[PDB]
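User: Hi! Is it possible to get a structure for several chains at once, not just one? Here's what I have:
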Amino acid sequence: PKHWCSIVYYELNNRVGEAFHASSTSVLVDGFTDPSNNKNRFCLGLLSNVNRNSTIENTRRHIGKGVHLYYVGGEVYAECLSDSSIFVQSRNCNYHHGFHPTTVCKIPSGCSLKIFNNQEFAQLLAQSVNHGFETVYELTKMCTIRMSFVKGWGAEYHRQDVTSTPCWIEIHLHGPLQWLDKVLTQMGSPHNPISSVS
Amino acid sequence: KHWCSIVYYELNNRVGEAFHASSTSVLVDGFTDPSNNKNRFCLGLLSNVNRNSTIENTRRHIGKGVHLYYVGGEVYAECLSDSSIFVQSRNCNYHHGFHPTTVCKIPSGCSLKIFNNQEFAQLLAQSVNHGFETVYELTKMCTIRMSFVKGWGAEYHRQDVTSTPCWIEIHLHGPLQWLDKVLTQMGSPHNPISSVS
Amino acid sequence: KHWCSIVYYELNNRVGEAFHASSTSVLVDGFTDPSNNKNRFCLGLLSNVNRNSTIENTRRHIGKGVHLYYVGGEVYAECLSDSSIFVQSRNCNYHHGFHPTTVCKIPSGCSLKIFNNQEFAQLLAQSVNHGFETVYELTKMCTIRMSFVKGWGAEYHRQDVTSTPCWIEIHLHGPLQWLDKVLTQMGSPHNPISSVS
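Assistant: Yes, the chains can be modeled jointly so their relative placement is included. Here is the combined structure:
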């Protein structure tokens, strides 16, 4: 039930509630109200937001059974249990399918999708160990995934960024981040030495 | 298992970390004990890069603050500060018959019952086959807001709590948990929201 | 032990969860270990939706960051980063005789003792009786701020630390706790026990 990830919730550009830390390979992020943030569920219903408004409140009402994140066999899956769709932006996935990096994938109610593969990422990590601190640092972006409930964003939608959708989350993958750490530790980059003034 | 969690605010911004109750008696004061693992939720040590003189003024008057007591399925609010306190509690407001947004003033030394489980559970019951929309609204019954020194809303300016320099939000876990047990009833079929609009 | 807690900011915004020291040796770097339960407080993995190029430029130069060392009742700061670091610590300023707001630059690979509670305990005692106002003031001594790469205050263009792209604030729990024992004994208010519980 390792803590493979930690998840942060948002409502537009504002962060809402405390962070959730996975204590099992199966975590449910729903719009219900169990305050226990110590186990299986990450309930968004009880969360408050002084900056909230009708349209976000409306969207929150339809998160429902939300999404099912599942970690198994060095691969994470996302199942949309909510009656509404869910949209995900995973670079690792986008690479495995050959889509453009910023590509947003819709996961329809009841459906499922693999949003990450470790061996794949480890390989990409390897293929750049000796290519540049700049490009290896960029792999950080690979370890975070963003998905919003109900409202899409990107091409075909009016909303272009995830900061415009009323309900979304960001998932940090600890395994990948840690391995990436073991490698980044080898920096010593005096490159582009900047100013301490300007 | 924490009968509640509390959060602190200075105007519209959140300040400091969330406090999780480990006992039936909790003190939310303006002093400085860093420990956030037991009896007190100290606000004096918290910083705010957006802080201003007036908010700071208020902070100096928080003092012993408010005492939150949970017993026999009822929670009480006692003002230990030399200054008054103001509480907005739907449950409380529902029990006295006041308007839902009514903000009650609690003078220094006075006490006020701000939540009665019995009633809430009852409401939750009458809510059942009354729909998902109205049961979902019971979530608002589970959180309570109170400000230190300054009041807000009616009998002041009709202004939002976000207009007060020092205020907190209380989340009653007991009620929220029971509510969950019901909300999982499942529902909401209502013009299945667009994914573009 | 829980000798301090640390918060990260990019300009005027708080970024990431609070870190709590579980040992006397803590590393605050710009790398990416997600474990926030031990030795390191990695800033690299932290997201900020309000982040801009210049901030990202500075984050890339944090590197091995600063090393906060608690030992013998004194805390030390060591710049392991290849770029300098800047520290504002009242206690330290007092000891050296500088002005309260003085910002001390800690060059790459250098070291500076930034806190001595023994002297702070002394300061606390001297104020034990000189006003609640002056004792309340010592709260400030308990917090320390330091940015990475960008100097600030006098000796620089930027004056406010909320003007630098990568700065943290450190709260010293021991000093804060001892200060609590006093502020409460001097308690500006009065109401001995509860009337409800």
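The helical segments of chain A are 54-60, 91-96, 118-126, 133-137, 174-184. Chain A has one domain: 1-198.

User: Great, thank you!
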